Protein backbone atom coordinates (compact mmCIF):
# COMPACT_ATOMS: atom_id res chain seq x y z
CA UNK A 1 0.00 0.00 0.00
CA UNK A 2 2.39 2.63 1.28
CA UNK A 3 5.89 1.65 0.30
CA UNK A 4 6.19 5.34 -0.51
CA UNK A 5 5.34 5.62 3.16
CA UNK A 6 9.05 5.95 2.81
CA UNK A 7 9.23 7.57 -0.61
CA UNK A 8 6.17 9.77 -0.19
CA UNK A 9 7.36 10.55 3.32
CA UNK A 10 10.40 12.14 1.73
CA UNK A 11 8.29 14.51 -0.33
CA UNK A 12 6.33 15.64 2.70
CA UNK A 13 9.56 16.98 4.12
CA UNK A 14 10.05 19.35 1.22
CA UNK A 15 6.42 20.34 1.60
CA UNK A 16 7.08 21.45 5.15
CA UNK A 17 9.66 23.84 3.75
CA UNK A 18 7.85 24.97 0.62
CA UNK A 19 4.91 26.40 2.51
CA UNK A 20 7.05 27.77 5.30
CA UNK A 21 8.97 29.46 2.55
CA UNK A 22 6.19 30.26 0.16
CA UNK A 23 3.44 30.70 2.73
CA UNK A 24 5.34 33.62 4.13
CA UNK A 25 6.51 34.70 0.69
CA UNK A 26 2.95 34.38 -0.49
CA UNK A 27 1.46 36.23 2.44
CA UNK A 28 4.14 38.87 2.01
CA UNK A 29 3.32 39.31 -1.65
CA UNK A 30 -0.29 39.69 -0.62
CA UNK A 31 0.55 42.38 1.88
CA UNK A 32 3.01 43.59 -0.73
CA UNK A 33 0.03 44.27 -2.87
CA UNK A 34 -2.63 45.28 -0.39
CA UNK A 35 -0.39 47.46 1.75
CA UNK A 36 -1.17 50.85 0.24
CA UNK A 37 -4.89 50.22 0.38
CA UNK A 38 -4.37 49.54 4.06
CA UNK A 39 -3.27 53.03 4.98
CA UNK A 40 -5.43 55.08 2.65
CA UNK A 41 -6.58 58.56 3.61
CA UNK A 42 -9.80 59.63 1.92
CA UNK A 43 -11.32 62.95 2.93
CA UNK A 44 -14.94 63.84 3.51
CA UNK A 45 -14.76 67.63 3.31
CA UNK A 46 -18.20 68.63 2.12
CA UNK A 47 -17.99 72.18 0.79
CA UNK A 48 -19.21 74.48 3.53
CA UNK B 1 -29.52 53.62 21.59
CA UNK B 2 -30.12 53.68 25.33
CA UNK B 3 -30.41 51.05 27.94
CA UNK B 4 -33.66 49.44 26.89
CA UNK B 5 -32.35 50.33 23.47
CA UNK B 6 -28.84 49.75 24.75
CA UNK B 7 -29.95 46.22 25.49
CA UNK B 8 -32.33 45.98 22.49
CA UNK B 9 -31.40 48.65 20.11
CA UNK B 10 -28.54 47.55 22.23
CA UNK B 11 -28.45 44.71 19.92
CA UNK B 12 -27.57 47.86 18.03
CA UNK B 13 -25.94 49.61 20.94
CA UNK B 14 -24.47 47.43 23.63
CA UNK B 15 -24.98 44.36 21.49
CA UNK B 16 -24.01 46.30 18.49
CA UNK B 17 -21.24 47.08 20.55
CA UNK B 18 -21.44 43.29 20.07
CA UNK B 19 -23.16 43.26 16.62
CA UNK B 20 -21.15 46.36 15.77
CA UNK B 21 -23.40 48.78 13.98
CA UNK B 22 -23.67 51.78 16.25
CA UNK B 23 -20.43 51.21 18.10
CA UNK B 24 -19.09 51.05 14.61
CA UNK B 25 -20.88 54.36 14.41
CA UNK B 26 -23.19 53.23 11.66
CA UNK B 27 -26.30 55.02 10.45
CA UNK B 28 -29.44 53.39 11.83
CA UNK B 29 -31.43 53.99 8.67
CA UNK B 30 -28.45 52.89 6.60
CA UNK B 31 -28.85 49.41 8.07
CA UNK B 32 -32.00 48.65 6.07
CA UNK B 33 -31.28 45.87 3.63
CA UNK B 34 -31.34 47.30 0.13
CA UNK B 35 -34.71 46.75 -1.53
CA UNK B 36 -36.54 48.39 -4.39
CA UNK B 37 -38.60 50.48 -1.99
CA UNK B 38 -35.34 51.12 -0.24
CA UNK B 39 -33.81 51.84 -3.62
CA UNK B 40 -35.95 54.63 -4.99
CA UNK B 41 -36.41 55.59 -1.37
CA UNK B 42 -32.78 56.59 -1.38
CA UNK B 43 -33.22 58.00 -4.87
CA UNK B 44 -35.43 60.56 -3.19
CA UNK B 45 -32.98 61.08 -0.36
CA UNK B 46 -31.87 64.56 0.70
CA UNK B 47 -28.60 65.79 -0.72
CA UNK B 48 -26.52 66.97 2.21
CA UNK B 49 -27.83 63.79 3.75
CA UNK B 50 -26.63 61.78 0.78
CA UNK B 51 -23.13 63.06 1.31
CA UNK B 52 -23.39 62.29 5.00
CA UNK B 53 -24.50 58.70 4.60
CA UNK B 54 -21.84 58.42 1.96
CA UNK B 55 -18.93 59.34 4.19
CA UNK B 56 -20.42 57.14 6.86
CA UNK B 57 -20.67 54.19 4.52
CA UNK B 58 -17.23 54.51 3.00
CA UNK B 59 -15.60 54.92 6.38
CA UNK B 60 -17.43 51.84 7.56
CA UNK B 61 -15.85 49.98 4.70
CA UNK B 62 -12.58 51.56 5.65
CA UNK B 63 -12.19 50.34 9.19
CA UNK B 64 -13.92 47.18 8.03
CA UNK B 65 -10.99 46.39 5.79
CA UNK B 66 -8.77 47.71 8.55
CA UNK B 67 -10.84 45.36 10.72
CA UNK B 68 -10.57 48.11 13.32
CA UNK B 69 -13.15 50.42 14.85
CA UNK B 70 -13.16 54.06 15.84
CA UNK B 71 -12.43 55.16 19.40
CA UNK B 72 -15.14 53.84 21.67
CA UNK B 73 -15.42 57.53 22.31
CA UNK B 74 -15.56 57.97 18.57
CA UNK B 75 -18.04 55.08 18.71
CA UNK B 76 -21.33 56.75 17.98
CA UNK B 77 -23.28 58.88 20.44
CA UNK B 78 -26.11 56.80 21.80
CA UNK B 79 -29.74 57.76 21.39
CA UNK B 80 -29.18 61.16 19.82
CA UNK B 81 -29.55 59.85 16.26
CA UNK B 82 -31.80 61.53 13.77
CA UNK B 83 -33.95 59.03 11.99
CA UNK B 84 -32.74 60.15 8.64
CA UNK B 85 -34.93 58.42 6.12
CA UNK B 86 -37.76 57.61 8.47
CA UNK B 87 -39.69 60.75 7.56
CA UNK B 88 -38.64 60.31 3.96
CA UNK B 89 -38.65 56.53 4.04
CA UNK B 90 -41.85 56.15 6.00
CA UNK B 91 -43.31 58.65 3.59
CA UNK B 92 -42.38 56.19 0.89
CA UNK B 93 -43.90 53.47 3.04
CA UNK B 94 -47.09 55.39 2.51
CA UNK B 95 -46.15 55.72 -1.15
CA UNK B 96 -45.80 52.04 -1.91
CA UNK B 97 -48.76 51.84 0.40
CA UNK B 98 -50.44 54.11 -2.12
CA UNK B 99 -49.33 52.61 -5.36
CA UNK B 100 -50.10 49.63 -3.19
CA UNK B 101 -53.33 51.26 -2.20
CA UNK B 102 -55.10 52.19 -5.41
CA UNK B 103 -53.29 49.08 -6.49
CA UNK B 104 -55.51 47.27 -4.05
CA UNK B 105 -58.27 49.37 -5.56
CA UNK C 1 22.84 87.56 5.14
CA UNK C 2 22.62 86.84 8.88
CA UNK C 3 21.02 83.39 9.33
CA UNK C 4 18.50 80.93 7.80
CA UNK C 5 19.67 79.87 4.34
CA UNK C 6 19.28 76.07 4.15
CA UNK C 7 19.46 73.95 1.01
CA UNK C 8 17.07 71.38 -0.48
CA UNK C 9 17.14 68.12 1.40
CA UNK C 10 15.91 65.58 -1.15
CA UNK C 11 12.84 63.51 -0.31
CA UNK C 12 9.71 62.13 -1.95
CA UNK C 13 6.90 64.37 -3.10
CA UNK C 14 3.44 63.07 -2.26
CA UNK C 15 3.27 60.14 -4.74
CA UNK C 16 -0.46 59.73 -4.59
CA UNK C 17 -3.71 60.55 -6.19
CA UNK C 18 -6.91 62.04 -4.89
CA UNK C 19 -10.17 62.80 -6.59
CA UNK C 20 -11.80 65.84 -5.31
CA UNK C 21 -14.74 63.54 -5.67
CA UNK C 22 -17.26 65.36 -7.77
CA UNK C 23 -20.41 64.25 -9.36
CA UNK C 24 -20.41 68.00 -9.86
CA UNK C 25 -17.34 67.90 -12.05
CA UNK C 26 -19.23 67.81 -15.34
CA UNK C 27 -16.45 66.41 -17.52
CA UNK C 28 -12.95 65.38 -16.60
CA UNK C 29 -10.35 68.02 -16.76
CA UNK C 30 -7.79 65.33 -16.63
CA UNK C 31 -4.05 65.43 -16.69
CA UNK C 32 -0.74 63.76 -15.97
CA UNK C 33 2.89 64.73 -15.97
CA UNK C 34 6.34 63.16 -15.83
CA UNK C 35 9.44 64.96 -15.00
CA UNK C 36 9.20 68.67 -15.88
CA UNK C 37 12.14 70.95 -15.92
CA UNK C 38 13.02 72.78 -12.76
CA UNK C 39 16.35 74.53 -12.48
CA UNK C 40 19.09 72.00 -12.42
CA UNK C 41 19.69 68.62 -14.01
CA UNK C 42 21.73 68.20 -17.19
CA UNK C 43 19.38 65.47 -18.39
CA UNK C 44 16.31 67.56 -19.06
CA UNK C 45 17.95 68.69 -22.29
CA UNK C 46 16.94 65.56 -24.08
CA UNK C 47 14.03 65.24 -21.71
CA UNK C 48 12.99 68.51 -23.26
CA UNK C 49 13.39 66.80 -26.60
CA UNK C 50 11.78 63.81 -24.95
CA UNK C 51 8.85 65.87 -23.78
CA UNK C 52 8.89 67.02 -27.38
CA UNK C 53 8.40 63.46 -28.50
CA UNK C 54 5.76 63.63 -25.79
CA UNK C 55 3.98 66.72 -27.09
CA UNK C 56 0.68 68.32 -26.10
CA UNK C 57 -2.52 67.16 -27.77
CA UNK C 58 -4.72 70.22 -28.04
CA UNK C 59 -8.48 69.97 -27.99
CA UNK C 60 -8.67 73.06 -30.14
CA UNK C 61 -6.02 71.44 -32.30
CA UNK C 62 -7.36 69.89 -35.46
CA UNK C 63 -5.84 67.37 -37.84
CA UNK C 64 -6.02 64.34 -35.59
CA UNK C 65 -6.37 61.94 -38.50
CA UNK C 66 -2.90 63.13 -39.45
CA UNK C 67 -1.80 63.86 -35.88
CA UNK C 68 1.87 63.35 -35.06
CA UNK C 69 1.72 62.01 -31.54
CA UNK C 70 0.50 58.48 -32.23
CA UNK C 71 -1.33 58.86 -28.96
CA UNK C 72 -2.96 61.93 -30.41
CA UNK C 73 -3.79 59.93 -33.52
CA UNK C 74 -5.72 57.11 -31.88
CA UNK C 75 -7.21 59.69 -29.57
CA UNK C 76 -8.70 61.11 -32.73
CA UNK C 77 -9.61 57.78 -34.29
CA UNK C 78 -10.91 56.42 -31.05
CA UNK C 79 -12.22 59.86 -30.23
CA UNK C 80 -10.34 58.79 -27.20
CA UNK C 81 -10.17 61.92 -25.05
CA UNK C 82 -11.07 65.58 -24.97
CA UNK C 83 -7.54 66.85 -24.30
CA UNK C 84 -3.98 66.05 -23.33
CA UNK C 85 -1.13 68.50 -23.06
CA UNK C 86 2.45 67.70 -22.10
CA UNK C 87 3.01 69.99 -19.13
CA UNK C 88 6.43 70.30 -17.49
CA UNK C 89 6.35 70.74 -13.71
CA UNK C 90 9.52 72.19 -12.35
CA UNK C 91 11.90 71.71 -9.48
CA UNK C 92 15.66 71.92 -9.61
CA UNK C 93 16.63 68.48 -10.98
CA UNK C 94 13.09 66.98 -10.98
CA UNK C 95 9.41 67.52 -11.68
CA UNK C 96 6.66 66.23 -13.95
CA UNK C 97 6.10 67.11 -17.64
CA UNK C 98 2.93 65.72 -19.06
CA UNK C 99 -0.50 65.88 -20.48
CA UNK C 100 -3.44 67.77 -19.26
CA UNK C 101 -6.47 65.93 -20.44
CA UNK C 102 -10.21 65.98 -20.72
CA UNK C 103 -12.50 63.01 -20.99
CA UNK C 104 -15.79 61.42 -20.03
CA UNK C 105 -16.42 58.31 -17.98
CA UNK C 106 -13.95 56.47 -20.19
CA UNK C 107 -10.58 57.47 -21.42
CA UNK C 108 -8.10 57.42 -18.61
CA UNK C 109 -7.33 53.73 -18.72
CA UNK C 110 -6.24 53.49 -22.32
CA UNK C 111 -4.85 56.97 -21.84
CA UNK C 112 -2.10 55.57 -19.67
CA UNK D 1 25.78 45.74 -2.85
CA UNK D 2 22.72 44.34 -1.22
CA UNK D 3 21.76 47.69 -2.69
CA UNK D 4 23.24 46.31 -5.89
CA UNK D 5 21.54 43.07 -5.08
CA UNK D 6 18.18 44.77 -4.75
CA UNK D 7 19.28 47.31 -7.31
CA UNK D 8 21.90 45.83 -9.60
CA UNK D 9 20.21 42.52 -9.13
CA UNK D 10 17.17 44.43 -10.12
CA UNK D 11 19.22 46.42 -12.63
CA UNK D 12 21.70 43.80 -13.74
CA UNK D 13 19.26 41.13 -12.78
CA UNK D 14 15.62 41.73 -11.90
CA UNK D 15 15.28 44.79 -14.15
CA UNK D 16 15.07 43.15 -17.56
CA UNK D 17 11.97 41.00 -17.46
CA UNK D 18 13.61 38.19 -19.40
CA UNK D 19 16.72 38.50 -17.27
CA UNK D 20 14.48 38.13 -14.24
CA UNK D 21 13.14 34.92 -15.73
CA UNK D 22 16.40 33.45 -16.97
CA UNK D 23 17.55 34.12 -13.45
CA UNK D 24 14.52 32.22 -12.20
CA UNK D 25 15.15 29.00 -14.10
CA UNK D 26 18.89 29.45 -13.60
CA UNK D 27 17.99 28.92 -9.99
CA UNK D 28 15.54 26.13 -10.85
CA UNK D 29 18.56 24.02 -11.58
CA UNK D 30 20.63 24.76 -8.50
CA UNK D 31 17.70 24.70 -6.12
CA UNK D 32 16.36 21.52 -7.71
CA UNK D 33 19.41 19.31 -7.40
CA UNK D 34 20.42 20.88 -4.12
CA UNK D 35 17.17 20.43 -2.23
CA UNK D 36 17.12 17.00 -3.78
CA UNK D 37 20.44 16.37 -2.10
CA UNK D 38 20.07 17.87 1.35
CA UNK D 39 16.58 16.40 1.42
CA UNK D 40 18.06 12.98 0.80
CA UNK D 41 20.34 13.78 3.72
CA UNK D 42 17.34 14.44 5.95
CA UNK D 43 15.83 11.08 5.16
CA UNK D 44 19.30 9.64 5.53
CA UNK D 45 19.89 10.74 9.08
CA UNK D 46 16.27 9.77 9.66
CA UNK D 47 16.73 6.01 9.68
CA UNK D 48 19.50 3.87 8.15
CA UNK D 49 16.94 1.07 8.06
CA UNK D 50 17.49 -0.19 4.53
CA UNK D 51 19.67 0.12 1.41
CA UNK D 52 22.38 0.55 3.89
CA UNK D 53 21.34 -3.09 4.13
CA UNK D 54 23.65 -4.14 1.28
CA UNK D 55 26.79 -4.10 3.42
CA UNK D 56 24.71 -5.86 6.03
CA UNK D 57 23.20 -7.89 3.19
CA UNK D 58 26.89 -8.48 2.66
CA UNK D 59 26.62 -6.86 -0.70
CA UNK D 60 27.50 -9.86 -2.83
CA UNK E 1 4.47 42.38 -48.60
CA UNK E 2 7.53 42.21 -46.38
CA UNK E 3 8.28 45.67 -47.76
CA UNK E 4 5.59 46.79 -45.31
CA UNK E 5 7.86 46.14 -42.36
CA UNK E 6 10.91 46.29 -44.62
CA UNK E 7 12.37 49.74 -44.33
CA UNK E 8 15.21 51.40 -42.47
CA UNK E 9 12.52 52.38 -40.01
CA UNK E 10 11.29 48.95 -39.11
CA UNK E 11 14.81 47.76 -39.77
CA UNK E 12 15.82 49.98 -36.89
CA UNK E 13 12.91 48.51 -34.97
CA UNK E 14 14.52 45.11 -35.33
CA UNK E 15 17.90 46.54 -34.39
CA UNK E 16 16.21 47.54 -31.17
CA UNK E 17 14.41 44.30 -30.41
CA UNK E 18 17.45 42.16 -31.24
CA UNK E 19 19.20 41.91 -27.85
CA UNK E 20 15.92 41.38 -26.08
CA UNK E 21 15.15 38.77 -28.72
CA UNK E 22 18.28 36.95 -27.66
CA UNK E 23 17.08 37.24 -24.09
CA UNK E 24 13.62 35.72 -24.47
CA UNK E 25 15.08 33.08 -26.75
CA UNK E 26 17.47 32.04 -24.02
CA UNK E 27 14.47 31.95 -21.70
CA UNK E 28 12.77 29.39 -23.91
CA UNK E 29 15.89 27.29 -24.40
CA UNK E 30 16.91 26.99 -20.77
CA UNK E 31 13.27 26.28 -20.03
CA UNK E 32 13.44 23.26 -22.30
CA UNK E 33 16.55 22.30 -20.38
CA UNK E 34 15.40 22.40 -16.78
CA UNK E 35 11.91 21.26 -17.68
CA UNK E 36 13.16 18.34 -19.72
CA UNK E 37 16.51 17.73 -18.12
CA UNK E 38 16.79 15.81 -21.38
CA UNK E 39 19.74 13.44 -21.22
CA UNK E 40 21.02 14.77 -24.56
CA UNK E 41 21.89 18.11 -23.02
CA UNK E 42 21.80 16.83 -19.43
CA UNK E 43 25.14 15.10 -19.90
CA UNK E 44 27.16 18.28 -20.21
CA UNK E 45 25.75 19.56 -16.94
CA UNK E 46 28.48 19.37 -14.28
CA UNK E 47 27.50 19.12 -10.61
CA UNK E 48 24.09 19.28 -12.06
CA UNK E 49 25.41 15.82 -12.70
CA UNK E 50 22.84 13.73 -10.86
CA UNK E 51 24.99 10.64 -10.45
CA UNK F 1 -18.87 43.32 -71.13
CA UNK F 2 -18.15 42.64 -74.79
CA UNK F 3 -16.78 39.72 -76.65
CA UNK F 4 -13.23 39.74 -75.37
CA UNK F 5 -14.94 40.93 -72.24
CA UNK F 6 -17.93 38.80 -73.16
CA UNK F 7 -15.57 35.86 -73.01
CA UNK F 8 -13.42 37.29 -70.17
CA UNK F 9 -15.38 39.95 -68.52
CA UNK F 10 -17.53 37.37 -70.13
CA UNK F 11 -16.69 35.40 -67.18
CA UNK F 12 -18.76 38.38 -66.12
CA UNK F 13 -20.77 38.60 -69.30
CA UNK F 14 -21.20 35.42 -71.26
CA UNK F 15 -19.71 33.41 -68.43
CA UNK F 16 -21.47 35.56 -65.99
CA UNK F 17 -24.23 34.71 -68.04
CA UNK F 18 -22.68 31.52 -66.61
CA UNK F 19 -21.24 33.01 -63.35
CA UNK F 20 -24.28 35.27 -63.23
CA UNK F 21 -23.17 38.72 -62.25
CA UNK F 22 -23.91 40.91 -65.22
CA UNK F 23 -26.61 38.75 -66.70
CA UNK F 24 -27.98 39.01 -63.23
CA UNK F 25 -27.53 42.68 -63.97
CA UNK F 26 -25.11 43.22 -61.15
CA UNK F 27 -22.93 46.27 -60.60
CA UNK F 28 -19.35 45.61 -61.66
CA UNK F 29 -17.89 47.68 -58.86
CA UNK F 30 -20.35 46.14 -56.43
CA UNK F 31 -18.63 42.80 -56.97
CA UNK F 32 -15.53 43.79 -55.00
CA UNK F 33 -15.30 41.67 -51.89
CA UNK F 34 -15.95 43.87 -48.89
CA UNK F 35 -12.70 45.04 -47.31
CA UNK F 36 -11.75 47.91 -45.07
CA UNK F 37 -10.47 49.91 -48.01
CA UNK F 38 -13.65 48.85 -49.71
CA UNK F 39 -15.51 49.80 -46.56
CA UNK F 40 -14.60 53.43 -46.07
CA UNK F 41 -14.34 53.53 -49.82
CA UNK F 42 -18.08 53.10 -49.90
CA UNK F 43 -18.37 55.41 -46.92
CA UNK F 44 -17.16 58.08 -49.31
CA UNK F 45 -19.49 56.92 -52.05
CA UNK F 46 -21.74 59.35 -53.92
CA UNK F 47 -25.30 59.62 -52.70
CA UNK F 48 -27.51 59.16 -55.74
CA UNK F 49 -25.06 56.40 -56.47
CA UNK F 50 -25.59 54.93 -53.02
CA UNK F 51 -29.28 54.66 -53.69
CA UNK F 52 -28.58 53.11 -57.06
CA UNK F 53 -26.25 50.41 -55.81
CA UNK F 54 -28.75 49.87 -53.05
CA UNK F 55 -31.68 49.05 -55.31
CA UNK F 56 -29.36 46.94 -57.39
CA UNK F 57 -28.16 45.00 -54.37
CA UNK F 58 -31.55 44.42 -52.82
CA UNK F 59 -33.05 43.32 -56.11
CA UNK F 60 -30.17 40.93 -56.54
CA UNK F 61 -31.10 39.43 -53.23
CA UNK F 62 -34.67 39.39 -54.39
CA UNK F 63 -34.41 37.24 -57.47
CA UNK F 64 -31.70 35.36 -55.62
CA UNK F 65 -34.25 34.15 -53.12
CA UNK F 66 -36.65 33.81 -56.01
CA UNK F 67 -33.76 31.91 -57.60
CA UNK F 68 -34.89 33.59 -60.80
CA UNK F 69 -33.25 36.21 -63.00
CA UNK F 70 -34.53 39.21 -64.90
CA UNK F 71 -35.43 39.01 -68.58
CA UNK F 72 -32.32 38.24 -70.56
CA UNK F 73 -33.37 41.48 -72.15
CA UNK F 74 -33.59 42.88 -68.66
CA UNK F 75 -30.22 41.17 -68.17
CA UNK F 76 -27.81 44.06 -68.06
CA UNK F 77 -26.65 46.04 -71.07
CA UNK F 78 -23.19 44.87 -71.99
CA UNK F 79 -20.20 47.16 -72.02
CA UNK F 80 -22.03 50.40 -71.36
CA UNK F 81 -21.40 50.28 -67.61
CA UNK F 82 -20.04 53.26 -65.74
CA UNK F 83 -17.22 52.26 -63.48
CA UNK F 84 -18.92 53.68 -60.48
CA UNK F 85 -16.38 53.59 -57.71
CA UNK F 86 -13.34 53.29 -59.91
CA UNK F 87 -12.74 57.03 -59.94
CA UNK F 88 -13.73 57.19 -56.30
CA UNK F 89 -12.33 53.79 -55.40
CA UNK F 90 -9.13 54.12 -57.35
CA UNK F 91 -8.80 57.51 -55.74
CA UNK F 92 -8.90 55.66 -52.45
CA UNK F 93 -6.39 53.23 -53.91
CA UNK F 94 -4.15 56.26 -54.05
CA UNK F 95 -5.32 57.14 -50.56
CA UNK F 96 -4.35 53.93 -48.85
CA UNK F 97 -1.41 54.24 -51.17
CA UNK F 98 -0.80 57.53 -49.41
CA UNK F 99 -1.45 56.61 -45.84
CA UNK F 100 0.46 53.67 -47.20
CA UNK F 101 2.92 56.06 -48.74
CA UNK F 102 4.06 58.36 -45.97
CA UNK F 103 3.46 55.20 -44.03
CA UNK F 104 6.31 53.76 -46.04
CA UNK F 105 8.03 57.04 -45.25
Tab-separated table of C-alpha atoms in Angstrom, chain B:
chain	number	residue	atom	x	y	z
B	1	UNK	CA	-29.516	53.615	21.588
B	2	UNK	CA	-30.119	53.682	25.327
B	3	UNK	CA	-30.414	51.052	27.940
B	4	UNK	CA	-33.663	49.441	26.888
B	5	UNK	CA	-32.354	50.327	23.466
B	6	UNK	CA	-28.836	49.751	24.754
B	7	UNK	CA	-29.952	46.220	25.491
B	8	UNK	CA	-32.327	45.981	22.486
B	9	UNK	CA	-31.404	48.646	20.114
B	10	UNK	CA	-28.537	47.548	22.225
B	11	UNK	CA	-28.449	44.710	19.924
B	12	UNK	CA	-27.566	47.860	18.032
B	13	UNK	CA	-25.937	49.613	20.937
B	14	UNK	CA	-24.470	47.433	23.629
B	15	UNK	CA	-24.981	44.364	21.488
B	16	UNK	CA	-24.009	46.303	18.493
B	17	UNK	CA	-21.239	47.077	20.550
B	18	UNK	CA	-21.438	43.286	20.074
B	19	UNK	CA	-23.158	43.259	16.618
B	20	UNK	CA	-21.155	46.359	15.766
B	21	UNK	CA	-23.402	48.782	13.982
B	22	UNK	CA	-23.666	51.777	16.254
B	23	UNK	CA	-20.434	51.211	18.104
B	24	UNK	CA	-19.088	51.049	14.610
B	25	UNK	CA	-20.882	54.360	14.408
B	26	UNK	CA	-23.191	53.226	11.665
B	27	UNK	CA	-26.305	55.020	10.454
B	28	UNK	CA	-29.443	53.391	11.831
B	29	UNK	CA	-31.425	53.993	8.672
B	30	UNK	CA	-28.453	52.887	6.603
B	31	UNK	CA	-28.855	49.409	8.074
B	32	UNK	CA	-32.001	48.654	6.071
B	33	UNK	CA	-31.284	45.874	3.629
B	34	UNK	CA	-31.343	47.297	0.132
B	35	UNK	CA	-34.705	46.751	-1.528
B	36	UNK	CA	-36.537	48.390	-4.386
B	37	UNK	CA	-38.597	50.477	-1.995
B	38	UNK	CA	-35.338	51.124	-0.241
B	39	UNK	CA	-33.808	51.835	-3.623
B	40	UNK	CA	-35.954	54.627	-4.986
B	41	UNK	CA	-36.414	55.589	-1.375
B	42	UNK	CA	-32.783	56.588	-1.379
B	43	UNK	CA	-33.216	57.997	-4.870
B	44	UNK	CA	-35.432	60.560	-3.190
B	45	UNK	CA	-32.983	61.081	-0.358
B	46	UNK	CA	-31.870	64.560	0.699
B	47	UNK	CA	-28.601	65.790	-0.722
B	48	UNK	CA	-26.523	66.966	2.213
B	49	UNK	CA	-27.830	63.794	3.754
B	50	UNK	CA	-26.627	61.780	0.775
B	51	UNK	CA	-23.129	63.056	1.309
B	52	UNK	CA	-23.389	62.291	4.996
B	53	UNK	CA	-24.499	58.701	4.604
B	54	UNK	CA	-21.841	58.417	1.956
B	55	UNK	CA	-18.933	59.342	4.193
B	56	UNK	CA	-20.422	57.142	6.862
B	57	UNK	CA	-20.673	54.187	4.516
B	58	UNK	CA	-17.234	54.510	2.998
B	59	UNK	CA	-15.598	54.923	6.379
B	60	UNK	CA	-17.427	51.840	7.557
B	61	UNK	CA	-15.847	49.983	4.697
B	62	UNK	CA	-12.575	51.557	5.651
B	63	UNK	CA	-12.185	50.338	9.189
B	64	UNK	CA	-13.922	47.181	8.027
B	65	UNK	CA	-10.989	46.390	5.794
B	66	UNK	CA	-8.774	47.708	8.547
B	67	UNK	CA	-10.838	45.364	10.716
B	68	UNK	CA	-10.566	48.105	13.323
B	69	UNK	CA	-13.155	50.418	14.853
B	70	UNK	CA	-13.158	54.057	15.840
B	71	UNK	CA	-12.430	55.159	19.400
B	72	UNK	CA	-15.137	53.837	21.666
B	73	UNK	CA	-15.415	57.530	22.311
B	74	UNK	CA	-15.558	57.969	18.571
B	75	UNK	CA	-18.038	55.081	18.712
B	76	UNK	CA	-21.328	56.752	17.976
B	77	UNK	CA	-23.279	58.877	20.437
B	78	UNK	CA	-26.112	56.799	21.800
B	79	UNK	CA	-29.736	57.764	21.389
B	80	UNK	CA	-29.177	61.159	19.822
B	81	UNK	CA	-29.546	59.853	16.264
B	82	UNK	CA	-31.805	61.534	13.767
B	83	UNK	CA	-33.945	59.028	11.986
B	84	UNK	CA	-32.739	60.152	8.637
B	85	UNK	CA	-34.927	58.420	6.120
B	86	UNK	CA	-37.760	57.610	8.473
B	87	UNK	CA	-39.687	60.745	7.561
B	88	UNK	CA	-38.640	60.310	3.960
B	89	UNK	CA	-38.652	56.532	4.039
B	90	UNK	CA	-41.845	56.151	5.995
B	91	UNK	CA	-43.314	58.650	3.586
B	92	UNK	CA	-42.380	56.189	0.886
B	93	UNK	CA	-43.897	53.475	3.044
B	94	UNK	CA	-47.094	55.391	2.510
B	95	UNK	CA	-46.153	55.715	-1.147
B	96	UNK	CA	-45.800	52.042	-1.913
B	97	UNK	CA	-48.763	51.841	0.396
B	98	UNK	CA	-50.443	54.108	-2.122
B	99	UNK	CA	-49.328	52.608	-5.363
B	100	UNK	CA	-50.096	49.626	-3.194
B	101	UNK	CA	-53.327	51.263	-2.201
B	102	UNK	CA	-55.098	52.188	-5.410
B	103	UNK	CA	-53.289	49.080	-6.494
B	104	UNK	CA	-55.511	47.268	-4.046
B	105	UNK	CA	-58.267	49.368	-5.564
